[PDB]
Assembly symmetry: C3
Homo-oligomer: 40 residues x 3
C-alpha cells in the first residue's frame, strides 16, 4: 500500500545506516593494512 511505499524509504535509510557504521568501523580497519606481516 501507500504507507509501505514511504516505509521502504525508512528501510532505505536503514540501509544507509548500515553502510555508514560499516565505514565507521572500517575507519579503524582502514589503517590496518600499511604495516602487515612479512618475511620468514
Amino acid at each position: 500500500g501507500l504507507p509501505d511505499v514511504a516505509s521502504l524509504r525508512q528501510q532505505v535509510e536503514a540501509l544507509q545506516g548500515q553502510v555508514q557504521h560499516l565505514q565507521a568501523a572500517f575507519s579503524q580497519y582502514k589503517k590496518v593494512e600499511l604495516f602487515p606481516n612479512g618475511g620468514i
Copy 2:
C-alpha cells in the same frame, strides 16, 4: 516504465545484499585490529 519502477526495488535488495555480505566478510576483518604490529 512501471515494471522498471518495481525492478529498482529488486536492485535495492541487491544493494543490501552487497552490504550484508560485506558485513559478513567484515566479521572476520572486524576482529583483525586488536593485536596489530608495533614497536621496533
Copy 3:
C-alpha cells in the same frame, strides 16, 4: 515533490557508490586476515 522523488534515486546511486568504494578499499583489507599475529 515529483523531482525529489527521482532525486532520491540519485541519492540511492550515491548509497551504492559508498558500498562500491568500500568494497574497493575492502579488497585490500580483504587479504589482510590470512597471516595475522599469534603465539607468545
